[PDB]
Amino acid sequence: ENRLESILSRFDADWTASDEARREAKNDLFFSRVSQWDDWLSQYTTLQYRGQ
Amino acid sequence: IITCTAVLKDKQLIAGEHIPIVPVFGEWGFVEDKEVYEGVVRLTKDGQRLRNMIMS
Amino acid sequence: MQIKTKGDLVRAALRKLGVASDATLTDVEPQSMQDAVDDLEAMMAEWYQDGKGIITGYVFSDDENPPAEGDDHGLRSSAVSAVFHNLACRIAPDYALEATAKIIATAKYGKELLYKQTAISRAKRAPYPSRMPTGSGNSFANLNEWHYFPGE
Amino acid sequence: MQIKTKGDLVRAALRKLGVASDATLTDVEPQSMQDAVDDLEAMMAEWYQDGKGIITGYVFSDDENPPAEGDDHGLRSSAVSAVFHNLACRIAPDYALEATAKIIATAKYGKELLYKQTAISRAKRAPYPSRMPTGSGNSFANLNEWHYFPGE
DSSP states (O other): OOHHHHHHHHHHHHHHHTHHHHHHHHHHHHHHHTOSOOOOSSOSSOOOOOOO | OBOSSOBSSOOOOOSSSSOSOOOOOSEEEESSSOEEEEOSSGGGHHHHHHHHHHHO | OOOOSHHHHHHHHHHHTTSOOSSSSOOOOHHHHHHHHHHHHHHHHHHSOTTSSOOOOOOOOOSSSSOSTTSOOOOOTTTHHHHHHHHHHHHGGGGTOOOOHHHHHHHHHHHHHHHHHHHHHTOOOOOOOTTOBOOTTOHHHHHTTOOBOOOO | OOOOSHHHHHHHHHHHHTSOOSSSSOOOOHHHHHHHHHHHHHHHHHHSOTTSSOOOOOOOOOSSSSOSTTSOOOOOGGGHHHHHHHHHHHHGGGGTOOOOHHHHHHHHHHHHHHHHHHHHHTOOOOOOOTTOBOOTTOHHHHHTTOOBOOOO
C-alpha cells in the first residue's frame, strides 16, 4: 500500500536482476579507463613491478 | 524524487508519452531471461592481463 | 616389538657389532651402556633439527628423571632397525672397531626409508603468485572481484 | 642432554678417539684436558668469525673465571655431536693418532647440518635497483610520486 514500499520493491527487483551485467560493465570501464591492474583486493602486501 | 527512506516528490507529471531516457547498446541479448550486453573490451581482458603479467 | 627402550637399542647395536650380547661371556660395563645412550641421544638430536629434520617420534629424556636408560624411545616399529644400525655405526669407533659393509649399507637404507615419507609430505607446490590473474573461466572468483590470485 | 659443559665435550671426543674413557683404566692428565679445552675454544672462535661464520650459541669463557672446564658450552641439543666429533678430529694429532673414517664423515655431516639453517637464513634477495621503475600498476606508489624504487 505504501508508495515508497512499492517503488523500492520495483527498484530492488530491477537492481538485483541486472547485477552481473552491471558488475562486468563497471569492470570493463575501469579496465579501459583507469588501470588494467585491477588488484584492489590485495595490493598492499608487497611492492613488485606491475607494468601496463 | 526518492531517497532510501522517503519520497520527496510524489508523482510529478512530465511532458511526453515515453520515458525520457534513451539507451544505446553494443552486443545485446538475453541468455536465460538475463540481459547481457558487451562492448569490445571484455573479451580482450584475459589476454591483456596475461601480457601485462609476463612483461612484468 | 621386543625393542622398547633406549637400552634395548644400545644392546642391539652392541650385538650387531659383535662387542657384547646376551650370549657372550663378557658384557660391557654399564658405563659403556651409558656412553652409548648419550650418543643415541646426541645422534637423535642431530637428526631431529628441532623439528626441521628427520621426524621419528623419538622421545628425548629429561634431566629430572635419573636413568636415561629405561625410558621408551617412542619410535615406530619401522624405525628401530635403522636407528640401531646407525647407532652401531656411530659407536663402533669407541672400541677401536669399524662396522662391516653390511651394517653401513643397512644404515644408509634405513635412513633413506626413514626420511622417505617426510620428503613426500614436504614436496608441496607453492601457491599462485600475487600477480597472476584468475581468468574469466573462474566465474565465481570473477563475479566476486577476485581478478588476481592472493599469493603468499 | 647429558653433555652440558666444555669438559663433557672433551671427554666425549676422547672417548670417540679411544684415548680415554670412564671405562678405561688409565685416563689422561688434567693438563691434556686443559689442552683439549684450549683446542675447542680456538676451533669455536675460528668457526664463529666474529659473528660472520657458523652460529652455534657457544659461550666463550672469560679470563677472570679461573676454570675454563666447568662452564656450560651453551650449544643447542642438535649441535653437540658435530662439535665433539670435530674436536676429536682436531685433537687426534696430539696423541700421534688419526681419526677413523667414520669420525671424519660424521664431522663433515655435522658441520654441514650446523651451517644449513644459517645458510637458509642468509639466502636473501637484494632489493630492486634504484633505477628500476615501480610501474603504473602500483597505483598507490604512483599516486604518491614513487615512480622509481629506492634501492640500497
